[PDB]
Write a protein that binds this ligand. Structure first.
Ligand SMILES: Nc1ncnc2c1ncn2[C@@H]1O[C@H](COP(=O)(O)OP(=O)(O)O)[C@@H](O)[C@H]1O
Ligand SMILES: Nc1ncnc2c1ncn2[C@@H]1O[C@H](COP(=O)(O)OP(=O)(O)O)[C@@H](O)[C@H]1O
Ligand SMILES: Nc1ncnc2c1ncn2[C@@H]1O[C@H](COP(=O)(O)OP(=O)(O)O)[C@@H](O)[C@H]1O
Lengths: 407, 230, 62, 248, 228, 371, 239, 51
């Protein structure tokens, strides 16, 4: 067949039109052009700024302070010359700018200034006047939780021994140091949590963080693993320094299997960098210099995978096992999950528990939720035992999900 | 590539090991075989690494039967094992049928053994190209077999080092009504073209099949053709 | 035998700039050396023992 | 690796090695069994192209299993030779046992079965040969069969394999004839398809090898076409294309 | 250390037949109980469709008029093991005229199981439970692809064997009547494994010392269904 | 803002009337805008921030009105904060406007960094709707119950005391409409849509994978009501790649409270998925996308051929019939190629035979292999 | 330890190569067998005679006994091999055993052959499944299916091949628990199933019938089209 | 590309491979990023069979 000659497309797009074509495409072009005219007439949209509610701010104090104070630059202090201790002289490093020899102000005092110490300095004389806190890496400091999760130990089901033994280490010495000190015992400082996925390890971590009352820092595998070498080790250094700053602190590592992988060499050097980061960590937990009042929690799904030095007691003193819940534990967690719902009073939960196979607590919450959706899809405001049994069937058959290899 | 194993196919359908064998072929000794009007002439060079090598101690043209002459491409030891097999096969045919083995049929059996070595995963083919001259029922025959198990009939051909020049030579320097003497002259001429360095009675050896019988040239006759001629 | 000598001598007598890469040194490298050659209009590229990369093509396995 | 050994399936279950054997057959010389009645033919043009080629047998593609059986060759040369020898051996077994000619389908199935058995066991390379059969037997008379490396066999009235096999079967399905399409029309159509598939203008006689089976005296004869008959066949096809030109 | 059983790992474990235990796991479960009254076996069919003949799946078999068998894993290898057990019983009885001890049947099947790297294929990916009687006692035995076997009073094999085994352990004692052990097995299989009992996907086989006939339970499950 | 959707598509005067209605309204816009104080506030603040104002980064806040700011030269300055700056809008990493002379903080600048995830924020869902999908009713109710109802009406779940489901996997043969359904649900509830294609989270850099997923969840929670789509999760789903899996799994299940962001993950090889990523706790909703049946195929044919001019002779049933051999994408392919075939022979009105040969050719190109 | 072989197991215990054989069977065409009240019927589709091809030679239905018949779907080369083995086994069993062959014995033989072919290194398994219908179930009809895993089962009605997922459900949709009175009705149901052919034309369906006492019976295309017409008349009742 | 006035962008399949995971995906996606930002254009993958 011959190709579409220009006349052929012309007649194709002319003969086949309705008697409306011209009007409605012209009207559409007017749509577009009138839209553009409206856009150019209204101008661009104001992106604006901060400017808190007008009654809140200003005062002549703002401009007076702006014209009276000094925009101090920030400099690393170094090598207090201390040549005669009547005027000591200091060295400062203005990053990517310069290095200066300076003195204190009439306000600050020599005892207030230490080496390093990240001091502030004026802009033209470069005289030092302000004590500034050290540079904590932002991607390390946002790691502090700053908000307790809405979970308590009562929400954890079945694992009475596990929660007792973990509270013995992460909560009891902080709450009651007298028991340990008057008996003259040193409590453990490292707890590892291991078990199958979905057994409640992260839930126990959430409960601990809610009941900690001290500085609690979560840690995730992705946070430590930077791209550039040594950077993850650097962040862990800053993290442990931050923990030392707090009067006691709790450190939680979630899925430490991401970094704690056992060292291997013959794999053309292997991952190595992750091994270097976990090596800086393995030193920080217990190396030179005492760790301090830093109690540390790790949870992982592969306890055997971590490097043996990380399993080592003195850094991981108490190891806890979260196994698949027993019948009593299944009943307890079913009660706990059913507390929040609007259900029948006569739900015989232990029946549902004994219908459950070796199901983790995540499965229990899932089947409870599936009962919730059954009730909601039925529009009923009460979840019934029939809803719970359909939920059990759905969840269990879904997990179970030719297959002629069977018997 | 697909050459470390002999019993597998490549995605394009090639069994790379056997063209590797053919690459070993044509890297060996140059040799040229042509068919004249009456007889068949096969010529091959004899040039060793050092002058110490007494070349007459190692013949290259071998009579399978009194009516069959055989030449190879250069793979010495593989040629020897294959020529032993060919001699025994010719003897079996000679005794079974009470008649001498046909040249084409002899080449068929030799290529059949060749194919037998082109299978399994723990053996390799003999990377040898075989030129067979023979007389059968008053007709002269020149055949060529290759390690793949295939065989063909050539009025004239050549293999070994610098074989393309021999091919062009026998393309323009040949006609099917050549006499035996002129056939040997054409053979030594294409040998001169293909070979590097001069030759004497020492450096060439030639076998000629005539319908009465086959015979390998004495080195003196080889010099008579190669030297003082052409 | 003097391949590199003679190429270098040709480059020195001419206004060319002599870039050299040995074949034992993937395709990104080839594109980079060609681009580098483009940067100097009369430049000359020399590949040393290119046979290793220019051997016959067949069905490749690994 | 899956493709390295014949006994390993793909995750989809396909076998790579026999597929590679068919793509090998893709390189084979064009050869077909043509559509004929009261006769059959196996035309197989020779890929051999060189002046000093002797072609002393005058036949290297079509092999006569017996005076009522002929087979074509398209595949590995040595594999094809050993396979043809095995065909003659199997026919000899059947005849010596029965003193009756072997049926076409039975012999074809026997060869394809031993081929499948060879492909099935490990440490062994599949026979990279496909082939065609032209025969006459008691049960069905004139028959043309096609067989592949996997051991698959089938009946085709007109089929072609080798170089441009798809194109050949395509124009065979294009100008397909049936019924009164006798042996001579089969020669004409084979000449047409050979000229179309081959790139040679005025296709040369020596480049093509043709054979045909015809029931003479009830004892049958298989004649492989000599130079002269091919010559006037090709010349007649050339003047036939000239006649087709004359219509304009 | 993946090619076969002829490779030893640094911990000594052969990294081929652990996958045979895992192949035991993928198969449907089987339960066996050893009681003084009789030895019983229960078996789940995992029936794909009702168009299937339920008896066609031979996951419950009769080795001999004094011994029955159930098993989990691969069905073809299981059938081969069952065939050997039957021919071994036939030969030993026809020659010696003494009853084959069930333990001896386990020994013979295990000796076959030791034929993948011990002579001159692959481990038989199936675990078996035998329940039999003899002139000296009614017994239940279990064996695995590794060729080891053990005497058990209450054993569970196949998929989800852990929960069923825990329930079977908790319900079992040495003085159960066969009726109570059977009923406990049925209620356990009902609660944990699939669903309420039905003749289409579950099968039972019991053996008593004085009963060489009707080694199975068939077309009488009705009295169970209403009274379960 | 965007135009209304005119919903006749055949060329009829109803389409016209809707159009000139729209023209009327935009013309009133033009009229109104063409037919055409706080100097105290400006004279204080916008004169205190004397032009020009530099742009820098906030690092830390030390006092109520004192903070550390870096600039593009990399220097660090302890400066004061003027009272009008919203303190709650200030955090480490925030872009801040600064007085040129005294570097004093004079306001927060709305963020214009993190370019890549800013691009994958797409938000350009409106090309489809639940209308554009026909016959996937079971899947529609499932995903509505899982992700759409909790976003539109979380009241039911909060009243029930239910924490809503927090993960959905879609699976099935390709071309069944998983991506279309995800885009459609993104359109139904106007919550911000996030799409990231599978292998694209796999990166050469060791950190870039987990880092990319972390920043994607960060931006998702920043947009608050959001839906994140990972198509071909198989590319990651089936140490470094496993570490990205661990990051995603913990972002799903792990510490902190995720809130409102929903997760849709589409796979073609669900059975090859690793057990960890299919979390019973998180992923409680697995939605299969079977190959369309006769009714669904008919619906897809009507939907796709609806916008095409059709002849009378088209008997859709012979196109619908045979078996469930193909998906919706193949149906769109048949419709398109039938359009081209009608075009070649110069029909702007496709006929039945066009679709017949179109389906035949598609089935030819569908699968392959030697007999 | 991934599959890479036939005699090694994946870490979860599955043998992947038998699954690959199952997939190879899934690539094959449709094959739906049933057993009726007294007769057994079979219908094979997707003949696709390629004009120059003559359909008869391929023999999509093969009988190897005094009375038993069906081909094996998958790769037809393995089908012919197992056809030869079935011929040899049935003839040998009839000649050697005191009583003639039964369908159960031949089904077990085929299953054991497939298993013994699978259970070794360097031996490619038969990637073909089959549906066996026999007469001598003590003078009753019955149907078996054979799976390349070396496994055999006994169906009332089964489907394998490209439509295995579909037609089986179709069977589950309407396989009447009432034994099919007027087994012609069962043949009409088989024809309705064959209307679900890969080409769905129904004009090239090759059908066989055997009444559990008769020998092999073959249905010609015109008489099969008669049953197709009866099925179409039944389908047109929806008006 | 010349006659239809659309822009020409060429990237060979051999250029696609690269020595690192996560680079071919990135390079293809950004190749189509140039494709979209150039607007009317044609994308060439010479020797796509290499991948
Ligand atoms: N013993 C339990 N009691 C109450 N809730 C539980 C229990 N085990 C699991 N859950 C529920 O299931 C989830 C389990 O997650 P978790 O196991 O902590 O993750 P990970 O395995 O990554 O640590 C929790 O959100 C919790 O709500
Ligand atoms: N013809 C020659 N005359 C002088 N020196 C030579 C000659 N050929 C090679 N050389 C010596 O060999 C060295 C390397 O030679 P090179 O140019 O690398 O040859 P090729 O390129 O063949 O390897 C040079 O330093 C040079 O001194
Ligand atoms: N049920 C359906 N309704 C409408 N269109 C569909 C349907 N199923 C598939 N499609 C077509 O297929 C394409 C979507 O394919 P999809 O299955 O979403 O891709 P993926 O497999 O990558 O998720 C769309 O172009 C759409 O037009």
């Amino acid at each position: 067949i011959r190709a579409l000659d220009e006349g052929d497309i012309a007649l194709l797009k002319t003969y086949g039109q309705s008697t409306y074509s011209r009007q409605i495409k012209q009207v559409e072009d007017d749509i577009q052009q009138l839209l553009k005219k409206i856009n150019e007439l209204t101008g661009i949209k104001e992106s604006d700024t901060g400017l808190a509610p007008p009654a809140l701010w200003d005062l002549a104090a703002d401009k007076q302070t702006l014209q009276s104070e000094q925009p101090l630059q920030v400099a690393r202090c170094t090598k207090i010359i201390n040549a005669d201790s009547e005027d000591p002289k200091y060295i400062i490093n203005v990053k990517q700018f310069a290095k200066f020899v300076v003195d204190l102000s009439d306000q600050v005092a020599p005892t207030d200034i230490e080496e390093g110490m990240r001091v502030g300095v004026d802009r033209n004389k470069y005289q030092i006047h302000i004590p500034l806190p050290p540079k904590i890496d932002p991607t390390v400091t946002m790691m502090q939780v700053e908000e307790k999760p809405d979970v308590t130990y009562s929400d954890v089901g079945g694992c009475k021994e596990q929660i007792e033994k973990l509270r013995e280490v992460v909560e009891t010495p902080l709450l009651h140091p007298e028991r340990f000190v008057n008996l003259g015992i040193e409590p453990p400082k490292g707890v590892l949590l291991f078990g199958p996925p979905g057994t409640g390890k992260t839930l126990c971590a959430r409960a601990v963080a809610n009941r900690t009352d001290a500085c609690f820092i979560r840690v995730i595998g992705s946070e430590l693993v930077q791209k550039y070498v040594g950077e993850g080790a650097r962040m862990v250094r800053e993290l442990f320094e931050m923990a030392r700053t707090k009067k006691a602190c709790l450190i939680f590592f979630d899925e430490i299997d991401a970094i704690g992988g056992a060292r291997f060499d013959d794999g053309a050097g292997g991952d190595n960098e992750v091994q270097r980061t976990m090596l800086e960590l393995i030193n920080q937990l217990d190396g030179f210099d005492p760790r301090g009042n830093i109690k540390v929690l790790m949870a992982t799904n592969r306890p055997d995978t971590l490097d043996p030095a990380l399993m080592r007691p003195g850094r991981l003193d108490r190891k806890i096992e979260f196994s698949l819940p027993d019948l009593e534990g299944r009943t307890h967690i079913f009660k706990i999950h059913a507390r929040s719902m609007s259900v029948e009073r006569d739900i015989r939960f232990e029946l549902l528990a004994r219908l459950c196979p070796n199901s983790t607590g995540a499965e229990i919450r899932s089947v409870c939720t599936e009962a919730g959706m059954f009730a909601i899809r039925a529009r009923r405001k009460i979840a019934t035992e029939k809803d719970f049994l359909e939920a059990v069937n759905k969840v269990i058959k879904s997990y179970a999900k030719r297959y002629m290899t069977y018997n | 590539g697909y050459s470390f194993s002999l019993t597998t196919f490549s995605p394009s359908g090639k069994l790379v090991q056997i063209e590797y064998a053919l690459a070993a072929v044509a890297g060996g000794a140059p040799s040229v075989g042509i068919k004249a009007a009456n007889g068949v002439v096969l010529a091959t060079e004899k040039k060793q690494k050092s002058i110490l090598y007494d070349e007459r101690s190692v013949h290259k043209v071998e009579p399978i039967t009194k009516h069959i002459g055989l030449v190879y491409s250069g793979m010495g030891p593989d040629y020897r094992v294959l020529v032993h097999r060919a001699r025994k096969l010719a003897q079996q045919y000679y005794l079974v049928y009470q008649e001498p083995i046909p040249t084409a049929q002899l080449v068929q059996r030799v290529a059949s053994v060749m194919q037998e070595y082109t299978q399994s995963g723990g053996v390799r083919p003999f990377g040898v190209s075989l030129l067979i001259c023979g007389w059968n029922e008053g007709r002269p025959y020149l055949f060529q077999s290759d390690p793949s198990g295939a065989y063909f009939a050539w009025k004239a051909t050549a293999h070994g080092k610098n074989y393309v020049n021999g091919k062009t030579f026998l393309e323009k320097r040949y006609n099917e009504d050549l006499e035996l003497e002129d056939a040997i002259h054409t053979a030594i001429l294409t040998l001169k073209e293909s070979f590097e360095g001069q030759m004497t009675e020492d450096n060439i050896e030639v076998g000629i099949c005539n319908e009465a019988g086959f015979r390998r040239l004495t080195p003196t006759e080889v010099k008579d053709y190669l030297a003082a001629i052409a | 035998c003097g391949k590199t000598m003679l190429a270098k001598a040709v480059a020195h007598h001419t206004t060319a700039a002599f870039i050299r890469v040995v074949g034992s040194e993937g395709p990104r490298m080839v594109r980079d050396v060609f681009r580098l050659a483009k940067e100097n209009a009369p430049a000359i590229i020399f590949i040393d023992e290119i046979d290793a990369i220019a051997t016959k093509r067949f069905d490749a396995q690994t | 690796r899956y493709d390295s050994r014949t006994t390993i399936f793909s995750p989809e279950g396909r076998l790579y090695q026999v597929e590679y054997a068919m793509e090998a057959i893709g390189h084979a010389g064009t050869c077909l069994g043509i559509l004929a009645n009261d006769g059959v033919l196996l035309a197989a043009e020779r890929r051999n192209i060189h002046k000093l080629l002797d072609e002393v047998f005058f036949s290297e593609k079509i092999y006569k299993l017996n005076e009522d059986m002929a087979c074509s060759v398209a595949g590995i040369t040595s594999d094809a030779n050993v396979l043809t020898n095995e065909l003659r051996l199997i026919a000899q077994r059947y005849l010596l046992q029965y003193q009756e000619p072997i049926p076409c389908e039975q012999l074809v199935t026997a060869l394809c079965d031993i081929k499948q058995a060879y492909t099935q066991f490990g440490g062994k390379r599949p026979f990279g040969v496909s082939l065609l059969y032209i025969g006459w037997d008691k049960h069905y008379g004139f028959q043309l069969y096609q067989s592949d490396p996997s051991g698959n066999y089938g009946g085709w009235k007109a089929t072609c394999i080798g170089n441009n096999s798809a194109a050949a079967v395509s124009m065979l399905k294009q100008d397909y004839k049936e019924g009164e399409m006798t042996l001579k029309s089969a020669l004409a159509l084979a000449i047409k398809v050979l000229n179309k598939t081959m790139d040679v203008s005025k296709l040369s006689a020596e480049k093509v090898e043709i054979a045909t089976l015809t029931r003479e005296n009830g004892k049958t004869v298989i004649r492989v076409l000599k130079q002269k008959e091919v010559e006037q066949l090709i010349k007649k096809h050339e003047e036939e294309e000239a006649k087709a030109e004359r219509e304009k | 250390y993946d090619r076969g059983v002829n490779t030893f790992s640094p911990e000594g474990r052969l990294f081929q037949v652990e996958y045979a235990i895992e192949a035991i796991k993928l198969g449907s479960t089987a339960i066996g109980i050893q009681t003084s009254e009789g030895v019983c076996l229960a078996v789940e069919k995992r029936i794909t469709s009702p168009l299937m003949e339920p008896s066609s799946i031979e996951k419950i078999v009769e080795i001999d008029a004094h011994i029955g068998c159930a098993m989990s894993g691969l069905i073809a290898d299981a059938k081969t093991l069952i065939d050997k057990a039957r021919v071994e019983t036939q030969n030993h009885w026809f020659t010696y005229n003494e009853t084959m001890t069930v333990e001896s049947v386990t020994q013979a099947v295990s000796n076959l199981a030791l034929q993948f790297g011990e002579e001159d294929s692959r481990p038989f990916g199936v675990a078996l439970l035998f329940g039999g009687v003899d002139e000296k006692g009614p017994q239940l035995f279990h064996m695995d692809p590794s060729g080891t076997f053990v005497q058990c009073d209450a054993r569970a094999i196949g998929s989800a064997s852990e929960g069923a085994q825990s329930s079977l352990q908790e319900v079992y004692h040495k003085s159960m009547t066969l009726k109570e052990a059977i009923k406990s097995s049925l209620i356990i299989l009902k609660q944990v494994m699939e669903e309420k009992l039905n003749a289409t996907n579950i099968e039972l086989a019991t053996v008593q010392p004085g009963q060489n006939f009707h080694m199975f339970t068939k077309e009488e499950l009705e009295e169970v269904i209403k009274d379960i | 803002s965007k135009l209304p959707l005119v919903t006749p598509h055949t060329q009829c005067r109803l389409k016209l009337l809707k159009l000139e209605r729209i023209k009327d309204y935009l013309l009133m816009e033009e009229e109104f805008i063409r037919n055409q104080k706080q100097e105290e506030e400006r004279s204080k603040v916008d004169d205190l921030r004397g032009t020009p104002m530099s742009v820098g980064t906030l690092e830390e806040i030390i006092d109520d009105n004192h903070a550390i700011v870096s600039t593009s030269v990399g220097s660090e300055h302890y400066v004061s904060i003027l009272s009008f700056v919203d303190k709650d809008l200030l955090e480490p990493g925030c872009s801040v406007l600064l007085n040129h002379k005294v570097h004093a903080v004079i306001g927060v600048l709305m963020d214009d960094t993190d370019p890549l995830v800013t691009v994958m924020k797409v938000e350009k869902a409106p090309q489809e709707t639940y209308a554009d999908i026909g016959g996937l009713d079971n899947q529609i109710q499932e995903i509505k119950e899982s992700v759409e109802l909790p976003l539109t009406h979380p009241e039911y779940y909060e009243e029930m005391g239910i924490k809503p489901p927090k993960g959905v996997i879609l699976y099935g043969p390709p071309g069944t409409g998983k991506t279309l359904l995800a885009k459609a649900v993104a359109n139904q509830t106007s919550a911000t849509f996030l799409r990231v294609v599978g292998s694209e989270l796999i990166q050469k850099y060791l950190g870039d994978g987990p880092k990319l997923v972390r920043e994607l969840f960060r931006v998702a929670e920043e947009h608050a009501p959001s839906i994140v789509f990972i198509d071909e999760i198989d590319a990651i789903g089936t140490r470094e790649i496993q570490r990205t899996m661990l990051e995603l799994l913990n972002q799903l299940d792990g510490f902190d409270s995720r809130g409102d962001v929903k997760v849709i993950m589409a796979t073609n090889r669900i059975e090859t998925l690793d057990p960890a990523l299919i979390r019973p706790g998180r992923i409680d909703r697995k939605i299969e996308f079977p190959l369309p049946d006769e009714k669904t195929k008919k619906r897809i044919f009507q939907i796709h051929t609806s916008r095409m001019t059709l002849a009378d002779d088209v008997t859709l049933d012979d196109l619908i019939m045979a078996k469930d051999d193909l998906s919706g994408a193949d149906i769109k392919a048949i419709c398109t190629e039938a359009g081209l075939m009608a075009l070649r022979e110069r029909r702007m009105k496709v006929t039945n035979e066009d679709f017949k040969k179109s389906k035949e050719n598609v089935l030819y190109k569908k699968q392959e292999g030697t007999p | 330890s991934y599959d890479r072989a036939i005699t090694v197991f994946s870490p979860d215990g599955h043998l992947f190569q038998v699954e690959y054989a199952q997939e190879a069977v899934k690539k094959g065409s449709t094959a739906v067998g049933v057993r009726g009240r007294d007769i057994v019927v079979l219908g094979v589709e997707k003949k696709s005679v390629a004009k120059l091809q003559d359909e008869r030679t391929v023999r999509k239905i093969c009988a190897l006994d005094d009375n038993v018949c069906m081909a094996f779907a998958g790769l037809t080369a393995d089908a012919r091999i197992v056809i030869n083995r079935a011929r040899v086994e049935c003839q040998s069993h009839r000649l050697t055993v005191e009583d003639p062959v039964t369908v159960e014995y031949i089904t077990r033989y085929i299953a054991s052959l497939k298993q013994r072919y699978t259970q070794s290194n360097g031996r490619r398994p038969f990637g073909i499944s089959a549906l066996i219908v026999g007469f001598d179930f003590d003078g009753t009809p019955r149907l078996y299916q054979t799976d390349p895993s070396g496994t055999y089962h006994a169906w009332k009605a089964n489907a394998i091949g490209r439509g295995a997922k579909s037609v089986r459900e179709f069977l589950e949709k309407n396989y009447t628990d009432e034994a099919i009175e007027t087994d012609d009705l069962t043949i009409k149901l088989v024809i309705k199933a064959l209307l679900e052919v890969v080409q769905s034309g129904g004009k090239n369906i090759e059908l066989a019938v055997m009444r559990r006492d008769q020998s092999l019976k073959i249905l010609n295309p015109e008489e099969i089209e008669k049953y197709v017409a009866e099925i179409e008349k039944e389908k047109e009742e929806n008006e | 590309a010349h006659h239809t006035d659309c822009t020409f962008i060429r990237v060979s399949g051999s250029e696609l491979v690269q020595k690192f995971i996560g680079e071919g995906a990135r390079m293809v996606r950004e190749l189509f990023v140039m494709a979209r930002e150039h607007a009317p254009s044609i994308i060439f993958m010479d020797e796509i069979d290499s991948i």
